[model samples]
Target: SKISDNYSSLLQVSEALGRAGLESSNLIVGIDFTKSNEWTGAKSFNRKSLHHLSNTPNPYEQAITIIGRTLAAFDEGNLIPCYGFGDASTHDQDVFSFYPEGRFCNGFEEVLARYREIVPQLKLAGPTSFAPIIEMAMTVVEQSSGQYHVLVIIADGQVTRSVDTEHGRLSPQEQKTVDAIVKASTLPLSIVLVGVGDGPWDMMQEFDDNIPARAFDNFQFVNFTEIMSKNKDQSRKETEFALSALMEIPPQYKATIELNLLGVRNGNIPQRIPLPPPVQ
Candidate 1:
């Protein structure tokens, strides 16, 4: 309650967040390209598919459009790096850009355009994994050049692996993902994880709460279905989704700043400090 007294007012918090350099925020997007997303395999662009190329955007597209568009506003130059995961493979994968060559897009429009361009060619197969994308986001945050980074990941909530070390239940890939998030927490990065579809999300929440001793809570999770159902107009939907998805970022950014973990600012490279060891 005493701590809440300091952040008691939204106006005060807003001012604090602004003072903390919210304008220097940058956006990165990661999309889940798993088989579960293609609702109908009969047609590549079927309305049933989450990646459908229709006038109406699919869930993933909607989240990307609204959330990415909103966040891009704070990023100077509006350049965003977008990546996709969930390709079929025997081994785990690293995330890859939707663009075959380039990694950063001019803005969310270009990011969405590139995603549309690659959807048809993409084979939606997977055991959903988040480590690669989170790892990549960490690298991006490190190279932020003095900007706070927010990674918006839209997924079906079906992660390929999981972890529960108490019973010796440890999924190596999920463990790696956990460690990555823990390490990333010490950087100028905030992850806004948006889940789509009706898949079980119990496994997904762990990334937000179960990770032991983060520098701060650098992760936030929201279900797209819930956001969609709660709002009426498109504008309202976008507002709710954007706010809910990113409401934690300002605080996370503030915490990163307070921790002095911002790797670079203006033109100077701050002395790097090691993060605490992640829970094994």
Candidate 2:
């Protein structure tokens, strides 16, 4: 899958949020390692002792570091909650939590250690499934009664399934995954697909709801190649871009979620939240 501009965009958006005093606590980040096979020999810096799977040049650590820095720039408790999902090699399928504190790199170390507690000696495995992973996140949010949820899936290949015939026709299983993600969107959760490495990103775009008048709405997708080409220093830029794109959630759905929280009895409501005054 072609990496999107999302990564850098997300980083920039985070910085903007910090300047606006929003910070990490208001965010939740999730990553999906779709193609573990292609991402071999990529592991964290402490790979020897930890034997962590290596792929995409230490994506797990990089994502954590990027998110951590974004949070550290803001006030405490404003840091967002981030979760990672990948095969054992990528650091186990279990979701690891990293609190807002410490420097970006240190936060990655902390998250890695916490992740190891659940799956010792986690090894990378094949056959990635995104729908189930997203479903798991939805379950978490629903149970916790979280007011907002954001799922960021970073993968290096097209969605894999037995179905999905030639000419881009979705198989039953493929459709199910799409439906699952769509359903997840109904909750306070928004989905973003960030493609990494060089591969066909069309399928990813399809999942991203890029097609005009598509049934699935309220999702976004971006390719990394676009950003990497424009910016020599891509890591930071990609992160910021992703964050900005996310903040532009559609008005109808945004209001729907807010209404769900406020209850219908509130009667007619304003079309949108008033923008805050400009900071000095």
Candidate 3:
């Protein structure tokens, strides 16, 4: 495509997406279930890892409540498919029917009461990997072609770098998921990772920095501690980062989304990107 053609196509697709109404959005909320999220119901092994949903929430809970609820507006049914990615996984639940056994919730709003109730029945176990759930989100995005998925990963970022997978090395398993994310880049999706506490969020910084090199620009990592002003309140700061995270999404929509009454109107298939298999 000519540079001019590509430019004009972008304008057309942008216009189409705005009014087409063919598009819908959903939330894929993945919680870092281990490391402080589970408070053990108190964990049998690490009793110290219990979290406080006593009145206020830990950073993970806060991130999900604030950011997850805000994004719920985009989903027509107000239903967000939430999951836990620590001692393994959970499913896309309807209501809070299944409790500690499944860690499920009906909607974003209900997760608080839902999780708290179920917590008393659990443990605080994990390396809390991001791979499984991310891949799950991709399947959802691909399957529901009419929808765009906004995935929020709430995790403890302290003591960890974003670039490293679970713990140290960028081993085969870590890279497999990293590669999947790059592959899913072509779909109608954007990822927001909220680091719940403090530590050197250097790995996250590196991941955010290097994403563009993969030709995908829809991933962001926001620091938790700095989300508020020393005195300033209101959802302003968190909202700002949240907004920045959504900023690049429209163009991404224009490219991979369905067309309006208008033909190609203007768009290109940003190729599906899957890196070479891990060297395991």
Candidate 4:
């Protein structure tokens, strides 16, 4: 290393991208609470806490804790809107809460505790998709008046179908539904999806292409195992990964600010945030 004594390209990249550029924002945390993330056998765990989640240091926990902390750093309130969805229903009891309109969570500790208790008892008989929760978070971003929102989804990477059901792919209807949400949104919204395990994730790449400049511009995908398998500092790598992920947010937020401002000045849209002060 002639030009560098102890320089690491990955470290440099992560540091440059991970700074908190947004003044204020909120996070919508979602996890796949269905059977796939469940612990399979009863032999290795305790009969007392046997219900405790398996796959210690599993992908779910890693994404939740590491990324959750990083995103919370960007949030002014350190508050997040959290949820865990099963294969079938929105009523899935795994979601957690703290905000004024009553949608914020205090910390990941409580949310994680609730998840540990809830994951084992739940049953997955039907299919699930990300559209419903995405709508909720989109509404939050829109109503923020000027604030930004990031929705973080961590899952086992199964795109519908399987030994659990007859279908083997995300349904065409739901796929289009998700695509439309990205295309139609008018707020400063971004999605970060982390694939936790080794399950097939080819379809996750659909959003990873980062095309259309506007539609998929705010999407990011990272495979946890792929990063972990390299034998480096797992925490540092994930930390850098989490920080660099937010690089896309600034452009989205800036575009929305410009659009929202122009709307008021041209008398085409309702007045929102107050105008910026003129230079001294």
Candidate 5:
């Protein structure tokens, strides 16, 4: 009963950690702008498209709304840096910020509004690359001081494999992303991947499972559609989803402290977040 009570909500856990002295995490939003999203052609402005600028939030919009709002509370300033990748109209492999030159997203509302503005203009490009965005978020984390960084990648399908694809093998591109993820692990960062549609996500699951040689487990994957199937209430689904997506952070944060991975700064070791007492 004690354990269940302590773990009832993410806010309680985060507050426990805050009392112990960890800094708030930073949230970076990466979106998939690939052709598989079906936002192209005579239906360039199609209401039926996944990228549709609808009165009702699309899957991608829903993810941004729910996950972004949840994580923003734990973010240092609620300022998110948002980017989109795989628009062949520019370059399929390229990553572009929704806001150019100055300013990160003020909050998820700005993120949603800006996203709405960009959808119709985006051609829904190809090859659904991820390495660029991973590397991009890593740069922000590497530059920060005393902050954990969370990169939220909301995508509709599996990561595109290399042309020389084979069964159970990491493609050249996949390897590059894995390599980047491994590097990011050493830094104070966690990557949370959310799948927005019903496409195959075995690769995303494989990614969460098979990452190796990291100081801690730094990846979490959740299929939002699967969660939607189980919960009919909007608030319940969103709460469940936010909990599911960020569930690993407390333990991951604990690991980073206990291992002394972030190191002593100003001659003070950061205090560890409290865990429940051992069973009798």
Candidate 6:
């Protein structure tokens, strides 16, 4: 199982974060297949094929690379929890579940098997709703008695509902989901949505409110075109950028575990963040 370069990029980012002193055990990553069925070739059935390119790794592999590297750098007891999500093809409902083995390794033989076991029995058909996924993440944050930090959501194309007349416009249900995400942000949570393939990314931007002069306070959106072009370097740049941006978070909320939703950004760097020297 050859890992994709994009996946390898993720590994680099995780490693950098670890070196920075951010505890690897305190990170949580969630991957969602909002439109897996739309993928062609092996990806149509093999969830990992979602982002294949010539001599490049698939999108899922890229995601796992970051995850595995981050987990590996943590102290034995510090491995962060990770989750995978999807729904029946063409259906707009949301379904959430934990990865069976509770952990995944990049290029590990068991990764695929663990992926299959976690995905619901339903097909990959759907209008693609993201609200439920955010809600579930909120539940996790609330239960931990910790401040919610960040969420990285990676999807293939525009977020569409069965009734959306156009791409990028949020349906009523999605709007509510957006509201939930927004409300959660006040706590607040940072969300990054990454559009993987060619599609109406404008819709994702619309939700993120990332216009040049007036991007929203807590949300950001990035398209794959700009990211994949730079590849490993881009991934590293974003990882550093994400951490630097994270510094703006109020100290009251800084200790909360960080959430990384992949797809929209790309590049490679280290995995650990070094803690500051102890006060005298």
**Candidate 1, which ten residues in sequence have the lowest lDDT sum?**
271-280
Q: Which has the greatest lDDT?
A: 5
Segments in model 5 whose C-alpha atoms lie over 4 Å from true places: 1-21, 39-48, 89-92, 162-166, 258-280
- Rank ordering of all candidates by TM-score, starting from the highest: 5, 1, 4, 3, 2, 6
Q: Candidates ranked by lDDT, best first? A: 5, 1, 4, 3, 2, 6
List model 6 lDDT by residue over 225-252, tens digit each: 3444454785574564344323323221
Each model's backbone clash number: 0, 41, 8, 6, 1, 47
User: Which residue runs does candidate 1 get wrong by more than 4 Å?
Assistant: 1-16, 39-47, 89-91, 162-168, 264-280
How large an RMSD does model 1 have?
Answer: 7.3
lDDT of each: 0.67, 0.45, 0.51, 0.52, 0.68, 0.44
lDDT of 1 at 56: 77
Worst lDDT 10-window in candidate 6: 270-279
lDDT of 5 at 79: 84
Residue-by-residue lDDT tens digits, candidate 3, 1-280: 1001222233454454576453566677666656544442232212334355555455556655676545555565666566555532221111112233433356766866555555545344455446555666665566565366777776664221245345556654346546656755656666777765443466566555564434455566766556542356565665554554454455555545432211222122332222211111
Candidate with best TM-score: 5
The positional error of residue 118 in candidate 3, measured at the CA in angstroms, is 2.9
Candidate 6 regions exceeding 4 Å error are 1-25, 36-56, 66-78, 89-91, 100-113, 116-122, 161-169, 210-216, 231-280
| TM-score of every prediction relative to native | 0.79, 0.58, 0.66, 0.68, 0.80, 0.56
Q: Give the TM-score of candidate 1.
A: 0.79
Error of 3 at 33 (Å): 1.4
Candidate 2 lDDT, tens digit per residue, 1-280? 1123332344464454454443222344555533343442233233232223445434444444444554343323443344444544332223333322312223434555444343233344435556555665565456445444455555554455554246566654456567666566445555666555554666676765443432225456655434444545655564554453454333323443444721122222212211111111
1-280, model 5: which lDDT tens digit per residue? 0011234576766666676576656788888888777632123223356676657667888788787656667667878888787775433345777765636888899988888777777667667667777777766665554356778898875566854546668765577677777766666677889887666777787667666666667787888878876847877887778777876677666665765545322222222121111111
Among residues 3 or more apart in sequence or in different chains, the pairs in candidate 4 whose N, CA or C atoms overlap within 3 Å are 97-104, 97-105, 98-104, 98-105, 99-104, 161-167
Backbone clashes in model 3, listed as residue pairs = 39-50, 39-51, 40-43, 95-106, 161-203, 162-203, 162-204, 163-203
